[PDB]
Amino acid sequence: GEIQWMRPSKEVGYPIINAPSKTKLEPSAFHYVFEGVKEPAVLTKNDPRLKTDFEEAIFSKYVGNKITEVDEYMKEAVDHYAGQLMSLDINTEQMCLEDAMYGTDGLEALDLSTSAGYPYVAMGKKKRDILNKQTRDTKEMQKLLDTYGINLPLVTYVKDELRSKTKVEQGKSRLIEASSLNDSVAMRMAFGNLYAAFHKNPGVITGSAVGCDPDLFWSKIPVLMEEKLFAFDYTGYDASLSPAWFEALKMVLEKIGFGDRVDYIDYLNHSHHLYKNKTYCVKGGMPSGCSGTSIFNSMINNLIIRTLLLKTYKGIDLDHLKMIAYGDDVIASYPHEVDASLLAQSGKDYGLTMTPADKSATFETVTWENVTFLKRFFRADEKYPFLIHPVMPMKEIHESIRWTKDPRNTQDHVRSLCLLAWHNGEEEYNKFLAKIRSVPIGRALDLPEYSTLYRRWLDSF
RNA sequence: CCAGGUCUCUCGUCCGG
RNA sequence: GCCCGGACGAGAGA
Ligand SMILES: Nc1ccn([C@H]2CC[C@@H](COP(=O)(O)OP(=O)(O)OP(=O)(O)O)O2)c(=O)n1
Ligand SMILES: [Zn+2]
């Protein structure tokens, strides 16, 4: 990805849009019961915690475009992945406007509680003003599509969220791109049966984990993997995707029968953004807040890894690759060990920055003991070895519990953390409950005992 | 008073068959 | 008891 031009939105006849400037995050009843490093990310330039220049920092990610041509390995990658998806029998038809808006089997409705994006946001117009879940009325949306069309600019916000200390000082706040409601609707009309097919088929055929529930999927994963795992992390995945990767996507889409709407992918490539008082253009890269990004990012990941394998190990048999991606996250396997330091070397040639999994300083054998996906580890149940726990380390749960957006959410919030926590085992969980109960508000909370959660987990199989 | 994307999963409240 | 569905809220993950 790479910026092409900034300029006051006035010169282009675009509205100024004002984001809020204060975080909604605030210390919890538990802020001092537990230790933690993270704090709310920089939202504005005038932030005392800044050790650098903000806007320079947040737009830094657009690292450039390495390649544009689909090379021979990419082509092979495309053919293999596409042929895989072909076995699912994906419905290639446009989705009617009603299902695109209101959801169908495998596709949730548009989120009524989020922004409707440009131009609606500058007209003080909301999704609730346009959509009606009970009647599923399409008349008003249809009119708006006719009136304003598609391919509208995105609106740019900084995400309000917790960030490590170094990310705060260095102004590394993540940016969000708010899709227009017209575009979300158009993208779902085009690609909705694709999204649903993916959501219904998490596993190694789609090469995607979208639609999975870790409490249950964790037990499937090791059975689906080949004998030898490998994994790594990307630095700046989306912003480092060069145009060649998107053509490769379009080629996969053409192959499985979406050829007639691959023009939508070109739109995701040449995008305009409104940020505060400015307007810019990006070339390449896929905006995160666009519809389908989850599916498309996972798809490209499937392409990237096949490509790197074909380049790095001549004569590799891709039929023996088993991988599951969730966007840039990935757990992968092959019947013989593959060296991710070698994969990362080849990655450089396609613009990709690949580093050791889970922030190791060096590349090391990935084992069932140290491998993580969706931030969770894998640990066999002591009593039932074939049942695997997704184990999210207490560290993250402690960071989360220390903050709140609204103290009215305390019960919901802590209870959700419990469902993540208990997988660390009865002893760590009980220690967790004691801490919570060490302050009065914690004693007002109804929290599940270990044995309840465990029986619930066993039952759910 | 509001404001701040796309998705998945889960829990909770309430309401149904 | 068990099943299923809906509206809203929240949490985590990508
Ligand atoms: N709020 C978010 C967070 C993540 N993602 C998607 C986009 C990128 C991908 C990977 O996200 P992370 O690896 O968790 O963050 P990052 O983009 O690499 O930023 P950082 O390196 O600072 O964590 O997931 C997203 O769509 N929306
Ligand atoms: Zn442009």
mmCIF file of N, CA, C and O in Angstrom, chain A residues 12-50:
data_model
loop_
_atom_site.group_PDB
_atom_site.id
_atom_site.type_symbol
_atom_site.label_atom_id
_atom_site.label_comp_id
_atom_site.label_asym_id
_atom_site.label_seq_id
_atom_site.Cartn_x
_atom_site.Cartn_y
_atom_site.Cartn_z
ATOM 1 N N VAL A 12 -11.335 19.332 -3.093
ATOM 2 C CA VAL A 12 -11.984 18.254 -3.826
ATOM 3 C C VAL A 12 -13.488 18.242 -3.555
ATOM 4 O O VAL A 12 -14.205 17.336 -3.987
ATOM 5 N N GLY A 13 -13.965 19.257 -2.841
ATOM 6 C CA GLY A 13 -15.369 19.322 -2.478
ATOM 7 C C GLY A 13 -15.810 18.130 -1.644
ATOM 8 O O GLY A 13 -16.772 17.434 -1.989
ATOM 9 N N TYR A 14 -15.092 17.887 -0.549
ATOM 10 C CA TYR A 14 -15.463 16.851 0.411
ATOM 11 C C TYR A 14 -15.596 17.464 1.807
ATOM 12 O O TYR A 14 -14.848 18.378 2.164
ATOM 13 N N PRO A 15 -16.561 16.967 2.595
ATOM 14 C CA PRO A 15 -16.862 17.520 3.917
ATOM 15 C C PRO A 15 -15.716 17.288 4.878
ATOM 16 O O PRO A 15 -14.950 16.340 4.729
ATOM 17 N N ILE A 16 -15.592 18.161 5.862
ATOM 18 C CA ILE A 16 -14.694 17.888 6.962
ATOM 19 C C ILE A 16 -15.469 16.978 7.908
ATOM 20 O O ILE A 16 -16.677 17.153 8.107
ATOM 21 N N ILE A 17 -14.802 15.967 8.450
ATOM 22 C CA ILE A 17 -15.465 15.121 9.433
ATOM 23 C C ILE A 17 -14.657 15.076 10.709
ATOM 24 O O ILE A 17 -13.437 14.917 10.683
ATOM 25 N N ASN A 18 -15.350 15.246 11.826
ATOM 26 C CA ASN A 18 -14.692 15.288 13.118
ATOM 27 C C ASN A 18 -14.943 14.048 13.950
ATOM 28 O O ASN A 18 -16.078 13.720 14.302
ATOM 29 N N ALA A 19 -13.861 13.353 14.253
ATOM 30 C CA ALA A 19 -13.926 12.240 15.171
ATOM 31 C C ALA A 19 -13.871 12.821 16.570
ATOM 32 O O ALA A 19 -13.450 13.964 16.752
ATOM 33 N N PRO A 20 -14.323 12.051 17.563
ATOM 34 C CA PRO A 20 -14.119 12.458 18.954
ATOM 35 C C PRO A 20 -12.623 12.464 19.236
ATOM 36 O O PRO A 20 -11.861 11.976 18.401
ATOM 37 N N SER A 21 -12.211 12.997 20.383
ATOM 38 C CA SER A 21 -10.786 13.119 20.705
ATOM 39 C C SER A 21 -10.411 12.516 22.063
ATOM 40 O O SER A 21 -9.227 12.427 22.407
ATOM 41 N N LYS A 22 -11.421 12.120 22.833
ATOM 42 C CA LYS A 22 -11.201 11.493 24.135
ATOM 43 C C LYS A 22 -11.508 10.009 24.033
ATOM 44 O O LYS A 22 -12.446 9.610 23.337
ATOM 45 N N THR A 23 -10.716 9.196 24.729
ATOM 46 C CA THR A 23 -10.996 7.769 24.840
ATOM 47 C C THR A 23 -12.245 7.516 25.673
ATOM 48 O O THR A 23 -12.626 8.328 26.527
ATOM 49 N N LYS A 24 -12.890 6.385 25.410
ATOM 50 C CA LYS A 24 -14.035 5.967 26.202
ATOM 51 C C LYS A 24 -13.579 4.993 27.286
ATOM 52 O O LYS A 24 -14.345 4.663 28.184
ATOM 53 N N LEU A 25 -12.322 4.555 27.188
ATOM 54 C CA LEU A 25 -11.716 3.642 28.143
ATOM 55 C C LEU A 25 -11.346 4.351 29.436
ATOM 56 O O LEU A 25 -10.917 5.501 29.411
ATOM 57 N N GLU A 26 -11.499 3.657 30.559
ATOM 58 C CA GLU A 26 -11.235 4.231 31.876
ATOM 59 C C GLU A 26 -10.916 3.109 32.871
ATOM 60 O O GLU A 26 -11.344 1.964 32.674
ATOM 61 N N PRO A 27 -10.180 3.436 33.953
ATOM 62 C CA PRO A 27 -9.729 2.385 34.873
ATOM 63 C C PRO A 27 -10.885 1.647 35.505
ATOM 64 O O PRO A 27 -11.943 2.224 35.771
ATOM 65 N N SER A 28 -10.661 0.361 35.737
ATOM 66 C CA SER A 28 -11.688 -0.535 36.223
ATOM 67 C C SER A 28 -11.729 -0.552 37.748
ATOM 68 O O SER A 28 -10.812 -0.070 38.408
ATOM 69 N N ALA A 29 -12.785 -1.141 38.297
ATOM 70 C CA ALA A 29 -12.804 -1.483 39.711
ATOM 71 C C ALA A 29 -11.612 -2.382 40.034
ATOM 72 O O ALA A 29 -11.216 -2.518 41.193
ATOM 73 N N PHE A 30 -11.030 -2.986 39.000
ATOM 74 C CA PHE A 30 -9.968 -3.967 39.195
ATOM 75 C C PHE A 30 -8.611 -3.476 38.707
ATOM 76 O O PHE A 30 -7.690 -4.278 38.528
ATOM 77 N N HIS A 31 -8.492 -2.163 38.510
ATOM 78 C CA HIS A 31 -7.332 -1.593 37.850
ATOM 79 C C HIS A 31 -6.081 -1.810 38.685
ATOM 80 O O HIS A 31 -4.975 -1.903 38.152
ATOM 81 N N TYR A 32 -6.260 -1.914 39.996
ATOM 82 C CA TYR A 32 -5.130 -2.081 40.899
ATOM 83 C C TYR A 32 -5.056 -3.474 41.487
ATOM 84 O O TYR A 32 -4.052 -3.828 42.089
ATOM 85 N N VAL A 33 -6.101 -4.272 41.302
ATOM 86 C CA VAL A 33 -6.048 -5.664 41.745
ATOM 87 C C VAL A 33 -5.106 -6.479 40.861
ATOM 88 O O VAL A 33 -4.474 -7.416 41.331
ATOM 89 N N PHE A 34 -5.033 -6.136 39.575
ATOM 90 C CA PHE A 34 -4.182 -6.873 38.648
ATOM 91 C C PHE A 34 -3.143 -5.957 38.025
ATOM 92 O O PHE A 34 -3.381 -4.760 37.866
ATOM 93 N N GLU A 35 -1.994 -6.527 37.662
ATOM 94 C CA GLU A 35 -0.947 -5.775 36.968
ATOM 95 C C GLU A 35 -1.253 -5.717 35.471
ATOM 96 O O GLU A 35 -1.970 -6.577 34.944
ATOM 97 N N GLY A 36 -0.710 -4.715 34.786
ATOM 98 C CA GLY A 36 -0.858 -4.599 33.343
ATOM 99 C C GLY A 36 -0.051 -3.447 32.746
ATOM 100 O O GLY A 36 0.219 -2.436 33.409
ATOM 101 N N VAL A 37 0.326 -3.590 31.482
ATOM 102 C CA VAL A 37 1.142 -2.577 30.815
ATOM 103 C C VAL A 37 0.347 -1.673 29.858
ATOM 104 O O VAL A 37 0.718 -0.523 29.634
ATOM 105 N N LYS A 38 -0.741 -2.193 29.301
ATOM 106 C CA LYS A 38 -1.462 -1.500 28.248
ATOM 107 C C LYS A 38 -2.280 -0.334 28.774
ATOM 108 O O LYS A 38 -2.753 -0.347 29.914
ATOM 109 N N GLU A 39 -2.414 0.681 27.925
ATOM 110 C CA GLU A 39 -3.264 1.823 28.193
ATOM 111 C C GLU A 39 -3.909 2.242 26.877
ATOM 112 O O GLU A 39 -3.507 1.760 25.821
ATOM 113 N N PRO A 40 -4.933 3.106 26.942
ATOM 114 C CA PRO A 40 -5.677 3.547 25.751
ATOM 115 C C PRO A 40 -4.777 4.236 24.718
ATOM 116 O O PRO A 40 -3.913 5.021 25.079
ATOM 117 N N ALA A 41 -4.986 3.933 23.444
ATOM 118 C CA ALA A 41 -4.080 4.379 22.401
ATOM 119 C C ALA A 41 -4.240 5.871 22.105
ATOM 120 O O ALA A 41 -5.272 6.460 22.393
ATOM 121 N N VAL A 42 -3.201 6.484 21.554
ATOM 122 C CA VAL A 42 -3.273 7.895 21.188
ATOM 123 C C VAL A 42 -4.372 8.139 20.146
ATOM 124 O O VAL A 42 -4.414 7.500 19.089
ATOM 125 N N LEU A 43 -5.272 9.059 20.467
ATOM 126 C CA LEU A 43 -6.366 9.426 19.575
ATOM 127 C C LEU A 43 -6.122 10.764 18.846
ATOM 128 O O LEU A 43 -6.672 10.984 17.759
ATOM 129 N N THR A 44 -5.307 11.645 19.445
ATOM 130 C CA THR A 44 -5.043 12.990 18.902
ATOM 131 C C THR A 44 -3.563 13.347 18.914
ATOM 132 O O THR A 44 -2.767 12.693 19.581
ATOM 133 N N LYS A 45 -3.218 14.403 18.177
ATOM 134 C CA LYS A 45 -1.857 14.941 18.110
ATOM 135 C C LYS A 45 -1.424 15.547 19.444
ATOM 136 O O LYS A 45 -0.279 15.384 19.864
ATOM 137 N N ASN A 46 -2.349 16.252 20.095
ATOM 138 C CA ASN A 46 -2.099 16.894 21.391
ATOM 139 C C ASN A 46 -2.117 15.928 22.579
ATOM 140 O O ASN A 46 -2.828 16.157 23.562
ATOM 141 N N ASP A 47 -1.342 14.854 22.490
ATOM 142 C CA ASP A 47 -1.325 13.853 23.539
ATOM 143 C C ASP A 47 0.051 13.860 24.188
ATOM 144 O O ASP A 47 1.049 13.538 23.537
ATOM 145 N N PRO A 48 0.105 14.249 25.475
ATOM 146 C CA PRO A 48 1.326 14.344 26.285
ATOM 147 C C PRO A 48 2.153 13.063 26.292
ATOM 148 O O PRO A 48 3.370 13.128 26.456
ATOM 149 N N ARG A 49 1.501 11.922 26.104
ATOM 150 C CA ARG A 49 2.191 10.641 26.119
ATOM 151 C C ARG A 49 2.986 10.379 24.849
ATOM 152 O O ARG A 49 3.694 9.380 24.756
ATOM 153 N N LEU A 50 2.869 11.276 23.873
ATOM 154 C CA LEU A 50 3.533 11.094 22.585
ATOM 155 C C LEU A 50 5.032 11.391 22.623
ATOM 156 O O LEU A 50 5.459 12.446 23.085
#
